[PDB]
Every structure is written in C-alpha cells, then in structure tokens.
C-alpha cells in the first residue's frame, strides 16, 4: 500500500530535501539536476519503523539517535514497496552484511549502479535511520549496539543490520549535471 506524493519545486519540503541533497556533495560532476522529489507514504512500513525506533530508544537511554541519511543501491524501486531488507546485504562488505547509508548524497550516488553517464536518470533515497548506540569501527550489530559508524578523503558511512531501523521517506529522481 505504498503511495508516492510528488512535491512541487515551490514547496518548502522539496527545497529542504533539494538543498540537503545539493549541499552534501563533496569531490573524490559538481551540482545535481534534481528532477523529482517524491514522499514515500506506506502505513505498514512506517508502523514497522516506529515500533523498532521505540525498541532501540528503550535500549539507549530513551534516545533513538535518529538521523536523515542518503542511500544508494540497485534495490531502490523494491525498497519503496517492500521496505529495507537486511537479507539482501553483501556478505563481503567492509562493515559486514548491513545496509549502508551516508550523510553525503555524493557518497550514496556511488552505490546507485551496484558497487559516468549524464543522460540516464538516477534515484537516491533520503531516509529516517535509527542508529541508536552506534559502534565506531561482522554479521550483526556488536553487543549492546544498534548500528556501525565508519570513516575510511575521510567520508562518514553508517551501517544497520536490521531493515526495520530505516524508512525510505524521500525518493529523489535526479541526474549528475555536466561540468560546463
């Protein structure tokens, strides 16, 4: 029961997600061509998220440690309908078998087509992620912990090992803009 709410570029919510998308771009293109920012409204994927959010709160001194983070994966189209699913994690990842996020849109943009075209439209997710007690760096969370924060330039990555601790709130259809 997923319904996509298309946001007007004149809407404060659109501009918020637009600036957050554009301002978090670093260099390893310069700016993005933001085409479509849609809200993801699924009552069951939401009640599943919030239920888990409260579980983590009670295990972390009444602090969910919630963050808005970007996500890229070949599974975006499936995620918005079936929710995040740790079962589809990669066994050999640097931080084990978890779902990867980043606070830089440009980081998540790397993982859109698995692990240089200006024409083909891309999609990222801008998600609510419950980090809870994040371990600074494997199969699951370490004991007493709910997420992994990594920092391998030195760009921050965040990994969860339970699909229900993230909700794909915004679907951003965009292109990387050609440097003039």
Numbering used by the authors: 952 to 979, 989 to 1075, 1088 to 1109, 1115 to 1129, 1134 to 1161
Could you pull the original sentences from the published paper?
Tankyrases are ADP-ribosylating enzymes that regulate many physiological processes in the cell and are considered promising drug targets for cancer and fibrotic diseases. The ART domain of TNKSs is located at the C-terminus and catalyses the PARylation of substrate proteins. When the first crystal structure of human TNKS1 was determined, it surprisingly revealed a zinc-binding motif present in the catalytic domain located about 20 Å from the NAD+-binding pocket. The zinc-binding Cys-His-Cys-Cys-type motif is located within a loop region of 12 consecutive residues in the ART domain of TNKS1 and TNKS2 and does not structurally resemble known zinc-finger motifs; however, the fold can be classified as a short zinc-binding loop.
As alternative strategy, we crystallized the wild-type of the TNKS2 ART domain and attempted to remove the zinc from the crystals. Treatment with H2O2 of TNKS2 crystals that were co-crystallized with our previously reported TNKS inhibitor OM-1700 did not significantly lower diffraction quality. While lower concentrations of H2O2 showed only partial loss of the zinc ion, incubation of the crystals with 25 mM H2O2 for 48 h showed complete loss of electron density corresponding to the zinc ion in the crystal structure. When compared to the structure of non-treated crystals, the structure of H2O2 treated crystals showed loss of electron density for the zinc ion and of several protein regions nearby. Interestingly, residues Gly1076-Arg1087 connecting from the zinc-binding motif up to the Ile1075 located in the G-loop could not be modelled after H2O2 treatment, indicating increased flexibility of this region. Although many of residues in this region are glycines, they form a helical structural element with a defined hydrogen bonding network in TNKSs when the zinc-binding motif is intact. Additionally, the residues Arg980-Ile988 also showed loss of electron density in chain A of the H2O2-treated sample. This region is located close to the zinc-binding motif and under native conditions is connected by hydrogen bonds to Ser1088 and Arg1087. Electron density for this region was present in chain B, likely due to nearby crystal contacts preventing flexibility. Apart from these unmodelled regions connected to the zinc-binding motif, the modelled regions of the two structures showed no obvious differences (root-mean-square deviation = 0.75 Å).
